[PDB]
Amino acid sequence: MKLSGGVEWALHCCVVLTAASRPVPAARLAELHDVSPSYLAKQMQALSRAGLVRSVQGKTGGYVLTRPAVEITLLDVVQAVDGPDPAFVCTEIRQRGPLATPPEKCTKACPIARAMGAAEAAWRASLAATTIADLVATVDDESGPDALPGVGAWLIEGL
Amino acid sequence: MKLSGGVEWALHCCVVLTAASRPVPAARLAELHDVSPSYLAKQMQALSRAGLVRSVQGKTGGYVLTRPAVEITLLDVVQAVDGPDPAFVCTEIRQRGPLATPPEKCTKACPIARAMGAAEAAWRASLAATTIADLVATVDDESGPDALPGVGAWLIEGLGH
Numbered sequence: 001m002k003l004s005g006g007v008e009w010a011l012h013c014c015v016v017l018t019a020a021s022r023p024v025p026a027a028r029l030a031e032l033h034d035v036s037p038s039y040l041a042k043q044m045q046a047l048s049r050a051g052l053v054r055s056v057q058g059k060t061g062g063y064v065l066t067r068p069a070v071e072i073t074l075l076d077v078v079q080a081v082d083g084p085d086p087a088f089v090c091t092e093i094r095q096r097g098p099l100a101t102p103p104e105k106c107t108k109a110c111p112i113a114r115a116m117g118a119a120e121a122a123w124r125a126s127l128a129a130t131t132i133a134d135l136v137a138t139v140d141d142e143s144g145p146d147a148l149p150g151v152g153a154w155l156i157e158g159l
Numbered sequence: 160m161k162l163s164g165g166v167e168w169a170l171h172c173c174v175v176l177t178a179a180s181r182p183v184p185a186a187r188l189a190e191l192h193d194v195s196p197s198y199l200a201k202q203m204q205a206l207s208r209a210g211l212v213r214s215v216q217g218k219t220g221g222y223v224l225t226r227p228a229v230e231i232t233l234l235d236v237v238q239a240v241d242g243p244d245p246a247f248v249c250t251e252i253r254q255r256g257p258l259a260t261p262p263e264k265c266t267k268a269c270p271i272a273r274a275m276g277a278a279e280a281a282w283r284a285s286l287a288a289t290t291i292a293d294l295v296a297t298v299d300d301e302s303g304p305d306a307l308p309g310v311g312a313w314l315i316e317g318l319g320h
């Protein structure tokens with residue numbers, strides 16, 4: 001099982017966008033992280049379709065967050081980039097074969113499906129409990145208070 | 160993310176094997192679930208390399224669990240079929256570019272990596288806290304105590320084929 005490789009890039013992008021006082025073009029985000037502009041654009045566009053960033057046009061355009069950092073969870077970002085579908089997909093195999101779960105016993109999910117679902121709930125709940133704000137606060141502590149504003153400064157030059 | 164599609168079948172195989180008092184071949188497990196024998200065989204071989212099932216040779220051979228149900232966790236089965244590797248891999252992107260942070264200042268894992276590592280720990284822990292025995296007990300409770308024994312009886316019927 002592998003998480004969409006864009007998740008790491010998107011999360012970092014959300015973090016540095018909190019430090020940008022103005023819209024940031026996908027190309028400058030890509031230059032900061034030394035990554036393919038077209039590739040980074042794809043992840044930003046997934047964030048966009050999830051209502052977490054918006055692009056605003058022109059030449060002075062680029063990307064902004066659409067609400068405060070405290071209101072965007074790692075689960076919001078992970079589901080935008082990697083998708084909403086649960087890791088385990090029950091295909092109702094219990095209804096196959098000569099000793100299939102009879103038709104009126106199919107009103108509850110399969111117990112295996114249920115147990116798998118509960119670990120999904122725990123992965124989701126962990127991701128929902130942390131915000132972009134939380135990440136920023138940790139970076140502030142570990143890198144020092146000037147680090148992210150230094151990045152933000154660099155991000156907006158020429159604008 | 161999507162778990163290997165084998166996991167659903169492998170979990171059901173582990174459950175039904177607890178009710179079997181004899182080795183059950185993959186072919187018969189495959190007839191039970193109405194699935195291609197070669198496809199199910201691949202799943203059973205993953206369980207075998209992980210030490211969860213053992214293959215019994217010969218005509219009345221087939222698969223047996225190698226431990227009591229209570230000592231086989233969902234995590235054991237999931238990692239047997241899907242692999243142990245974590246879903247999120249930090250590639251140290253913080254050390255790339257013009258404003259790259261220093262290698263001496265990279266003493267702890269990046270805060271993002273840590274959070275993603277904790278989520279995966281929570282998924283792992285939840286799977287590790289459920290056993291095949293738990294699954295059996297729920298099926299006993301929900302299908303009636305004769306369901307699994309009825310399946311077991313059917314799985315060993317006419318061994319030798």
Ligand SMILES: O=S([O-])[O-]
Nearest residue numbers: 187316317318320
């Ligand atoms: O393998 S025979 O029981 O159909």
Ligand code: FES
Nearest residue numbers: 090093094110113
């Ligand atoms: S029917 Fe899908 S997990 Fe059992």
Ligand code: FES
Nearest residue numbers: 249252253269272
């Ligand atoms: S450097 Fe890899 S997640 Fe931040």
